[PDB]
Structure formats: C-alpha cells, structure tokens
Design a protein around this nucleic acid. Structure first.
Ligand code: K
Ligand code: K
Ligand code: K
Ligand code: K
Ligand code: K
Ligand code: K
Ligand code: K
Ligand code: MG
Ligand code: MG
Ligand code: MG
Ligand code: MG
Ligand code: MG
Ligand code: MG
Ligand code: MG
Ligand code: MG
Ligand code: MG
Ligand code: MG
Ligand code: MG
Ligand code: MG
Ligand code: MG
Ligand code: MG
Ligand code: MG
Ligand code: MG
Ligand code: MG
Ligand code: NA
Ligand code: NA
Ligand code: NA
Ligand code: NA
Ligand code: NA
Ligand code: NA
Ligand code: NA
Ligand code: NA
Ligand code: NA
Ligand code: NA
Ligand code: NA
Ligand code: NA
Lengths: 108, 69, 97, 151
RNA sequence: GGGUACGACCAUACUUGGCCGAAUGCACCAUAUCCCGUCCGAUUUGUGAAGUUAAGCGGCCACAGGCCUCGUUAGUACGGCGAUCAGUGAUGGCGCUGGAACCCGGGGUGUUGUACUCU
RNA sequence: AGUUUGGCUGGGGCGGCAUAUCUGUUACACGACAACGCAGGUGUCCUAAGGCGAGCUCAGUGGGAUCUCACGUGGAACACAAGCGUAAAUGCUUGCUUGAUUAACGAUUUCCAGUACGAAUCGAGACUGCGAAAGCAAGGCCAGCGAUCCUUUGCGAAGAACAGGAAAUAUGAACAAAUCAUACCAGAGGUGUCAGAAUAAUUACCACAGGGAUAACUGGCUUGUGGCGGCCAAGCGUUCAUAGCGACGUCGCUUUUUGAUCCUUCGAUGUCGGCUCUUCCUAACCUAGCGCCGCAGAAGACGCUAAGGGUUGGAUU
RNA sequence: AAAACAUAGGUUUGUGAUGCAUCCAAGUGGUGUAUGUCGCAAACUGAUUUCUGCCCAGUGCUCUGAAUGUCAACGUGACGAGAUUCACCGACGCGCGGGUAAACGGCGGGAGUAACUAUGACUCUCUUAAGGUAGCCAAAUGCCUCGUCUUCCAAUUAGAG
RNA sequence: AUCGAACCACCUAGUAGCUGGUUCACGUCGAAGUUUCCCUCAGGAUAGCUGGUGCUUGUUAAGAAGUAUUGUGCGGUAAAGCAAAUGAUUAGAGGGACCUAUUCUCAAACUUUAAAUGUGCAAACAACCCAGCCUUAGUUAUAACAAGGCUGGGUAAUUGAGGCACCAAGUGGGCCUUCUUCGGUAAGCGGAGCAGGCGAUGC
RNA sequence: UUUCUCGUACUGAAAGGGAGGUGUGAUACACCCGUGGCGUGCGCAAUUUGUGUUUUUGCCCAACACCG
RNA sequence: AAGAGAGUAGCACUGUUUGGGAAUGCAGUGUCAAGCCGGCAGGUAUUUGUCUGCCAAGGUUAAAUAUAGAG
RNA sequence: GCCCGGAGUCCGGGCACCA
C-alpha cells in the first residue's frame, strides 16, 4: 500500500544503462585526479619554455550584467579600441607585448 | 463464480480490541463558529474589555509588591 | 412549461437598488471562434498522419436540457442569469390561462 | 441495498398516536431554552420543518446554540471504534426539556438543607425479628386444580 | 354560592333523552340614513332596546353508550440464561429467573389561574 | 494496415437488470443487516399545481320539488409509486402577487473514508410579496440527476483622486496607439457502464497463461419426479366393504429413471453399445413345500417359507 | 481417393493499341503481346438428350439523361488600418430519371359451395416486386416418422414401386 | 523431417493482475477474509485488525469499564384482538334483498393494547451553591433577563494506569456450531442477525 | 565575509504588497529588562502541618491582534 | 569617394521536427523582395511610431572535449 | 450546427462533427 509520499518524477526510462543489449549513455570521473596532475604538468612546462614571459596576458576589468550582479566586477576578454587610443598604444602592436585586445567592446 | 455478499461477523470483536474510545470532554473543542451572529459579535466586545482589565490588574499587583520590597 | 415575458426582480446595481421590471429572453450558446486557444491547440494536434486524436462521445442518454434565462433591465443595462429545472417544452407566452 | 433514503424505516416511528393527533400546544411554544441545557430529541411528525433524522429520535444531548426558531444540540454517535460528537439543527417543536438531572439536583438541595438545619432514620427489613402468625395455612396441591387445567 | 372576558391541561370534560334556573350578565330579538358585503342585512357590518327566558348557557337525572381508575383473567400466554435433558420427530417440561393482553366485576363522570363583578 | 467488439450471473449463452436511485415488507420493538427475495416506482410535470390573507367544508347517507334541511373524526383531497401528516386546515373557492431573486466561501444532517456529488435543516445581510397585526415565504417535504480538460455566457457602467491609498480588474516581459488573445469569480453544453475509455462479427484450421474458484462422464448429500408398498373404508363384485378389487384421504421405503447441487478430479481416472467371464441381491418367471378362493374335475387368482438350480434361437434397427 | 477438383460442351462481361487486364520504390522501366476480335483478359455452370417459367421494389452494376438542388481548393469583389469576416463562381460524385436476374437474390393467406357422405371445378375476400410454372420426392433435402398402400421373408425401424 | 505465414541473427533478460521456486538459530509480540471507490468480480487504492518507535503524565484515579444500582427518555417484535378501525371469512336469530345484535375461523406488506432481551443521558473539582461587584454596540417600555469575567465564604456498586502521535507489514476466496431467520419438496443446498469456534492448535 | 544551493517570510491568477509589546488618543503620538490575554499544566520557590499559593517550561483548547 | 554575396531571405499550402506555446528548425511545390527615410533579432497574433543589438545568403583556423565490443 | 426548397411553422433534402 502506498501512503503519504511525494509523486516521484524520476526521469529514467531512456535506455541509459549498459547491458547485454544496450551500449548505454554514461559518464564517469575515474580520471579526475589523473587529469588534475596532467594539467599542472603542462602549465609548468609552458612556463619553462616561454620564460620570462608572463603566464597569462593582461585583461581589462568589466561590470557584470543584470540586476543580480550589478555590483560585481570581473575580468574581460580584451581591451577596447578607445582605451588603447587613450593610452597611446597601437592595437596590432599591443597584441605583440602580451595585451589582449577586443574589437567589440563599447565603453559606454 | 459467485461469492459472499456481506457480513458483520467479527466486526464487533475488532471494534472492541482497542475499545470504543470515550467522547471528547465538553470543554475541549467548544467554538461557536456558525451560530447566532448578533450574540457572537457582542461577546467579542466583552472579551476585549476583559483582556484589558486583566493586563491592568497585573500592573497594580506588581507595583504594590515592588513598593513593599 | 409557460413563463411570463416580464418579471419584477431586485436589481443589485448601485443606481437601481430596488425591484425593477426585467425582460425575459432564453439564453443560446455563442459560436465557436476558431481562434480560441483550445481550438488552435486541437487543429495543430490534428494535422498530420495519425488519424483522429481525441474522443468523440457517441453515447448520448439525456433527452432534455436545463433552461437558462437572461434577464435584461431597462434603466440600468445589467443582465442576470437564472437556471430552471429540465423541461421538454419551454414557452414564453405570458398570457395567463 | 435498494431504496435507502432519508426516511426508510419510519412507518411506525413517525406515526403520531391513537386519539392524540394534532399540532403542538401553547405549553410547547412557551418553553425556554438556554445554552448548556439537557434536552431530548423526539420528532413530532405534524411539523415537517426541522425534523431530525431517524437516528436521533429518543437521544439526549446538550444545547450549544439558540436561534430564533431553532436549537442546536450535541449528540454522541459511535462510529467503528470511536464515538463522534455530532451537531444537529432542529426546530423548537422537536425538542423537550430533559429530567435526567433532577435527582442529582434534588440531592444537592437536600445536602445544603441538612447542613443549614444542622447549623441553626430508616427501618431495615434485612435484620431479623419476632413473628407472631396467629394462623397458619397449608399448601398441598389439591387434585381439583389438576382437573382445572382442562379447556 | 353564581356571571362575564382571557386561559392551562384537552372526554372523570364526549353523545342521546328528560327536569329545573333568584340577581348581575350572556343570548335570542328590532331596524338599514351612514361605514361595509351579499342573488337575498340568511351570514357579515352599522345603529338600539319594544319583548322573551321558547332556544342557546348553567345545574341535576338515566342499573344509557363512551371514557378514566382499581381488581380478575394469571404467575396464564410469551421470554433471557443451562443441560452428554425427554422425544423418531413435531415439540415439551425442568433449574435460576422477567412477566402481559382482551372479555368480565367494583367505583367515578372535570380540576383550576388572572381581572371585573351580584349576595 | 492497425485496433476494439461492456459487467453481474446457482458454469457460460439467450433472457433479465438485482449497473445510479425512492416507498412498504424481509428486518429479529435504538441504529445497521443479504439473495436473478416480495409488492410497486424514478430521468418527468407545474407562472401556477409557487407565496400570502380571507371565506368555506369534504366522501357519503336520509327526508322533500339541479334546489333545500339534518347527520357526517375524514371513511375525500393534497400532479405521480407508497408510507406519514392535516378540519374555522397542509383540503376547496377567491383576491393580490413573483421569496422559484440576491444571499459577504456562516454552520450542519443523510451516504460516509466521517471524501465528493445529489437532496435537506438552522442562520446573518439586501430588496420585496400578502396581511390591521403577530406572522409566513428565499419553490411545489421527503425520488426526479453529473468531475478534470475544452467550448460558451454574465459581472469588473459613466465620472471623482498630483497618486495606487478604505475607494480605479490584471497580463501579453525594450517602449507607446488601436484591435486581438489570455487569466481571476458565478452559471450553461455530459458522460444512464450514472466517482464519468472514443468501439462490429467469426473460428470445427485454431494458439498461449491458468482454473477443479467453473460446466460435460464416475462417486457423494436429497428424493420433487420415477419405482415399490402400508392404514381407513364410499363403492364394484348374482345379495355380500375386505375371494378378488378398491375411490376421496393419509403413512412410508428404495436409489435400478430424470431433475436439484457443485464436495473430489482440468501438469488428463480413456467417454455408448455389443462380444467374453465370474460373482452378489430379491421386490419369486419356472422347479420344492404349504394355506386360501366367487377352488366340482381340469385350468387358474391370491398369500407365506424359500435365491439351492435354471431362464433360449432369429428378421429390421 | 470421395459424390471433391479438372474436363469437353453452354452462357455472360471488358476491349480497336494514346486500348483492356496488370507488375515495380523509381525511369525513354515490365507481363498477356513473336499478339490484333476465328484475339486477349475476367466470371459462372459442367458430356449428350429435352428444357431453362414469373419478379428491377432491396443491394449492386450501368446510361450518349446533367436538366436542376447540394460541395473543396483555385479565382473575383466588398467593410476594416490590418489579421479576420462576408458575398459570388466552382468539377466528378450524391440526389432525381431510365436499363439490367445464365448480377446477388426472391417466388402468399382466409371463408362458402355439386341429388348418401367425402372432396370442391365454381364464388367471395385480404394481400405482394412477383405470389413456385414445367418437372421431381419421406430423395445424400420430411420435424412429426419406425408416415400410408403394394412387393420382397416364418418374421424386415432395412431395400424397391 | 520446419507452414491458417519457412529458416538464421538481432531489437530481447520483450510483457505477464497468472503457475512454480526463494538457503542459519533462539527470543518478545501476533492477525484478516469486513467498509467505500475503481471496464471493478483470480487485481488494487482506502478504513479496520497487528508490530515498531515513542511523547505527556500518575501512584489512590485525569477525558477509565463489551458489568451492575437509582433516576429519567425511546420502541411496536413475541403474545393478544376481530364481541374495536382496514382486509378476508362461516352459520343461525329478530325486524329474497337490506338493517340490528351475535357467532366459526384469520393477516410479512392489519391493529386499540403490549412484554422479555435492549437502547440514549446523568449521578461533582477545568464543577456546583450562596454573597458583593465589573463590562457589553445582546433582549425588554426601564427593575429584570442573557453572555464574558473578578473577589469572599461551603460542598452510583467494585474493578483499575488516563490521554496523544509517527512509520509500516500481512489481509481484503473463508468455513462450522447455538439461538432467530428468508428462498427451496429437500440437500453435506443458496442468502442474512447475535455470540463462540476452526483456519493459526496441540493435549 | 563563496562563486552555487538549502534555510532564516509569507501571500495573490497577476500588476504588487509584506507581519513586536504596552500606554494615550481617534507612515497618529510617547517609551523599550521583554511571555497579547484565559484554562489545564513537569519541576522549583515560599507558607500550614497535610493543605492552600507564586512563576510556570514543553504540549493542547478557546478569544484577540498583525501581514497578503 | 564608392561598395559589401538573389529564384537568396520572406510569404501561402502540405509534411516532419522542437520545451518553443496564433506556428523552434528544416524539406517539397507555388509565389518571390529591399537597399531615397535599408534589412534581420528583441519567446502572444495584426496595423502604426520609437528604442536597443547586429549586418545573412562565400572560405580557412590550434588548445581545453570523445574513444560506450578499434588499432 | 450550415445551405436550400415546400408548407416563425414542420418536413424533405447534400453537407459538418475534440466537453
Ligand atoms: K432575510
Ligand atoms: K485511460
Ligand atoms: K481412387
Ligand atoms: K468452361
Ligand atoms: K430488383
Ligand atoms: K435495380
Ligand atoms: K498486502
Ligand atoms: Mg489493502
Ligand atoms: Mg545478445
Ligand atoms: Mg469476497
Ligand atoms: Mg461475464
Ligand atoms: Mg425535490
Ligand atoms: Mg469444486
Ligand atoms: Mg492415465
Ligand atoms: Mg486406469
Ligand atoms: Mg488412404
Ligand atoms: Mg417429399
Ligand atoms: Mg433418406
Ligand atoms: Mg438383411
Ligand atoms: Mg421410395
Ligand atoms: Mg508458491
Ligand atoms: Mg501471545
Ligand atoms: Mg489460509
Ligand atoms: Mg570548418
Ligand atoms: Na411509535
Ligand atoms: Na463505470
Ligand atoms: Na421418492
Ligand atoms: Na412418488
Ligand atoms: Na465437379
Ligand atoms: Na408443384
Ligand atoms: Na424404405
Ligand atoms: Na526481462
Ligand atoms: Na470508469
Ligand atoms: Na490461485
Ligand atoms: Na486473493
Ligand atoms: Na526561395
């Protein structure tokens, strides 16, 4: 006898399980600690090769949209053309010395 | 195939296993929701005055005791 | 059943708060709009290859229908709806026997 | 299983009486009801309005509501393994004052009267005693009464 | 000992027949200008006493019917519980116990509140 | 090509509705109580057959020429089935009316899980009807009816507010003008399998999972029907109830007929008749022994003890 | 293993090739057709002999009747700012009217009446689309039924007439 | 060796309210075959019966009882009746029908009367009685009533743990006997009411 | 003080709004050591010689009040 | 000083697909643009006016991701 | 529920069906 329970809605009727007749549709994370080690090794290797260049290129500071994140700040894709002109740096030459450049930002 | 239709056998024995519980006391759920409204409304005005007098009585009782101490 | 053509009924409107003369007319259902939301949904579901997609209800048992009267007032244009019991012949002759 | 309506077994239950038909008298009209009283619920069968269901005929309860032409009574009713307190609304004609507490109240009035007199009993047949007959008959089952029981 | 008006219980108060009734009353009775309604002042409505206790009303009576009450029917009919009771059965008695009804017989034939009132 | 082709049921089918419901009875003097139990109903009808005031008294009977007098406890009427109820009325006639409207999600009863639906009871507010008034009336007393989704109708009249307030319905999400669509509240179109799928046949060419919860054959209980007998005696027998019979009634026995039931068996107890062969019973056809007659002889009827022995050959089927 | 199927014989239907029947998912695709009405395709009956009656209301098929009523897209006009709405036109078919049974099929009751009875040629009356004609029969078709008569046996629920 | 739709591999461990199976010990408790709804009748959901976990309490009884007593209500079954209403029905008597008074015999869907066994309520402390007050927009023409409060005086046997939750299982084919009963000629037959049993249990 | 989620606030279809007590007056005014009042209520405290009383925790019943 | 991809985008009908609901993407046939106040998008259809963001119908491109019966 | 015709009236017709 059922009693006072919630109505389940479990959403599991689409042959996701591997059996003798089905390949399945699954994703596991057994390689998570190994991939963490590999990514760290590549970052140290890249630093050794490009020495003494900085690991990450310079990026601008931008405002997050919508009313939920109005007051928050983060990093943007690249610097604006108006900003580069104000600091007296050419855009094609700026990319050469490790400055990210974005040609779509508006500076409102 | 036919079967039984209805019987009351064993039903009295089942009802007395945990007994016929006594009725609720008369002071437990005594609310006159659907009653005579003119009398219900008048009683509310008296009850509001009783609550106000109850609060005043404790104020004087406390003050008298504090004066003695 | 015979019914009068006029009745003296209370009017709930603020302007006419009293008993007034109402005119009696039987209610008839309006015509389906073809752009009602339920009709748009049904037409979309019906197009294609699967055949009929909804029930049709052929098993009719009742032989009468309830009578609804729309009562229209004169000074204040309000309308009041009333329901009578089921009957097989409704007339509005109003001429007393 | 057929035909269980509001008044099923009521041919003799709601019948009036022999040579006692009619409508409620003035004495019934002038009865006063107040909240907290004990009443009996009996049908009248000459008043169709406000007549209780057949289950509540002969039952006794307490009144919780007084209305211009009606009384509300609380009545117990056992359902399965419990008793439910039910509320019924009836007219004043189907309600009679109950005398189920007059003995108790009379006992209280006597107790205070006894104390009042004290401030200002019976003979037991169980115990033995002397008996003087002055005459004694005999029972002997005469043959005459054996012959009597012949119709 | 009475009357009238308003009542409570609603036959010990009813039904048929007979006899009697001071006073205050009640009632029958007289009459249609006005108010009012009918085929008809018969009922009803408005006016007012020239008479009559004939009737209505009250009291009493009847081996009268009914009704009320107590006995008798009768510890009868019927019933709850018990038996490794009787009997082929149908049924029945026993033990501990509850207990009627009709017929019939004796008695009875309203009790009373409030107000105004004649001896 | 795909799918369907109701249920209950003394097997199933045909029949019927006991499938949603109302009265009397079954029902055992609180309440509740089953059957394909018994006798009957329901899907309607009514602007009056609803509401109120007044006046009157019905069915019937008797005496007189439709009219008149007396009696008349309801023996009439109240739409329909039945029960209950009612006499200056709950009936009949008449006059005026629309309480059959609205009714802020008030409370409750019946079924009952103390859910809904249907029906019903007691109320508060508005506007009214009839009454000189007290008062009665939000249908005709209790049977007469219907969820989700969808469709369709009614209410959110006009003005007033320097601001969304005790008072102006809301949304179509970048913003504005007019259409359109959609929401919130109250009704209507229906599901009678009546707590509510959209639905025709056949199979002997047949298949699967099961069922002795369920039929056809043996066995078991019963004995209506079938068969075989007692008791009484009105009559029949030339007169003579009983040599032999015996009506109208009543009491039994048997399980060799047919019914009634559904206990065992559906992962199977080989289903008619004949042929062959053994055995048992007696309610006795022949053979043995007795009694009696309407038994002269002969031939027979009936009855008793008796089951040791015997009871045939063929035509059509 | 038959009484079934086939058969010769008989009858009906469609069709003159840009055809009738018909295969394939499709094409400058395929079959009867290397054919041409004494042909090809589709049905029913079943040698010979002698015959093959009446019914076109029902269902079907068909018509060189479209005469008029009804209807879908496409078209043509209007009101509106537009979505929308309305009006007109609109084929075959259906309806209406003919043909057809060797298409599927169908093919009646009740009274009275002739010199002994019995039967009823004759009469009357209901009623259909038509009311079973020529033949045949208790037949492999007849419930009642082991029908009734004759023959075949001593005797026949069997056989024959 | 396969045909009212061949064979091979795969979807496929297809679905089954139906049939079969389901592996150690001891201990504490311990049922149901009934209600309502369902294309429901070999199945479910729902309440009841049961287990576990408790919570709040008490030490003579708190809101205790399958039982009595006293008081006070309810009823139309057994019986009785037809010399009383309704219905059925036999025969004489007094004035062929008719009338009056009787008479034989009756009723699940008749009744004046009316048991036994039953069935509501009450018999005190969250209460009662009296005294003096307070409030109200309730009632009454107003002393007087209603209702909610405040402050002082006095108050039916005998058995014994009361009340309140949460979570969940099995069950939803029953059968027999005593007494009361309906259908049937009857039945080891079919259908009900009360109680006790078997099922689940031996001795 | 997470960058996300559950919770500390709910309500209406929606546009939207959004909950303390006492006192005094008819986005009102003034205070802030505080259970809104009533009933039944473990334990503790204080009295009488066992009774009566205070504060009552948790829980439950019935009446306010405040928010949508 | 100019220009920036036409049986293309759109619309009608039909079919399929999507959470996309008076129609999310696509396919077939019919019809078939603008660039002198341009075109597409802004999750409810229509007509009218603003605002915001982009500029389809040509092409190439590492890293962070898969290896569900391989080497 | 539409469009007709013959007598707002009933019938005959060709159409259309999500409580
Ligand atoms: K009212
Ligand atoms: K379904
Ligand atoms: K052969
Ligand atoms: K041929
Ligand atoms: K024909
Ligand atoms: K034809
Ligand atoms: K279970
Ligand atoms: Mg269950
Ligand atoms: Mg495999
Ligand atoms: Mg059952
Ligand atoms: Mg069946
Ligand atoms: Mg009704
Ligand atoms: Mg069996
Ligand atoms: Mg075998
Ligand atoms: Mg064998
Ligand atoms: Mg062979
Ligand atoms: Mg023949
Ligand atoms: Mg033959
Ligand atoms: Mg032979
Ligand atoms: Mg022959
Ligand atoms: Mg098993
Ligand atoms: Mg135990
Ligand atoms: Mg078992
Ligand atoms: Mg590429
Ligand atoms: Na009674
Ligand atoms: Na159903
Ligand atoms: Na027999
Ligand atoms: Na016999
Ligand atoms: Na042949
Ligand atoms: Na012939
Ligand atoms: Na023969
Ligand atoms: Na599987
Ligand atoms: Na259903
Ligand atoms: Na089983
Ligand atoms: Na079962
Ligand atoms: Na194009």
């Amino acid at each position: 006898p059922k009693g006072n329970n919630a109505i389940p809605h479990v959403h599991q009727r689409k042959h996701w399980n591997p059996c003798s007749s089905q390949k399945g549709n699954v994703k596991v994370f057994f390689n998570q600690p190994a991939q963490k080690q590999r990514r760290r090794r590549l970052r140290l290797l890249k630093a050794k090769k490009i020495f003494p260049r900085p690991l990450k290129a310079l990026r601008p500071q931008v405002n997050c949209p919508t009313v939920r994140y109005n007051m928050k700040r983060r990093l943007g894709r690249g610097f604006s053309l108006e900003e580069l002109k104000a600091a007296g740096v050419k855009p094609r030459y700026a990319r050469t010395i490790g400055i990210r450049v974005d040609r779509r930002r508006k500076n409102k | 195939a036919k079967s039984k239709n209805h019987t009351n056998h064993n039903q009295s024995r089942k009802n007395h296993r945990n007994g016929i519980k006594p009725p609720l006391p008369l002071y437990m759920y005594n609310s006159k929701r659907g009653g005579w409204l003119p009398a219900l409304v008048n009683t509310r005005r008296v009850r509001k005055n009783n609550q106000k007098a109850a609060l005043k009585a404790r104020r004087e009782r406390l003050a008298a005791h504090q004066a003695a101490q | 059943v015979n019914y009068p053509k006029k009745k003296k009924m209370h009017c709930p409107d603020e302007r006419c708060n009293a008993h007034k003369s109402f005119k009696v007319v039987q209610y008839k259902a309006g015509k389906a709009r073809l752009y009602a939301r339920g009709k748009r949904r049904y037409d979309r579901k019906q197009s294609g290859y699967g055949g009929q997609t909804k029930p049709i209800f052929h098993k009719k048992a009742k032989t009468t229908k309830k009578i609804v009267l729309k009562l229209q007032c004169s000074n204040c244009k309000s309308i009041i709806q009333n329901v009578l019991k089921r009957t097989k012949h409704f007339e509005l002759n109003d001429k007393k026997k | 299983v057929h035909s269980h309506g509001y008044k099923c077994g009521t041919r003799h239950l709601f019948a009036k009486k022999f040579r006692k038909h009619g409508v409620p008298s003035v004495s019934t009209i002038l009865t006063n009801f107040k909240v907290g009283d004990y009443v009996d619920v009996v049908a009248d069968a000459a008043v169709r309005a406000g007549m209780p269901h057949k289950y509540y005929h002969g039952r006794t309860g307490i009144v919780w509501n007084v209305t211009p032409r009606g009384v509300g009574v609380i009545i117990n009713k056992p359902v399965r393994n419990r008793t439910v307190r039910k509320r019924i609304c009836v007219r004043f004609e189907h309600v009679r004052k109950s005398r189920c507490q007059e003995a108790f109240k009379q006992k209280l009035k006597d107790l205070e009267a006894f104390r009042a007199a004290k401030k200002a009993k019976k003979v037991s047949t169980r115990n033995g005693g002397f008996v003087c007959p002055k005459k004694v008959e005999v029972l002997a089952r005469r043959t005459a009464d054996y012959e009597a029981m012949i119709p």
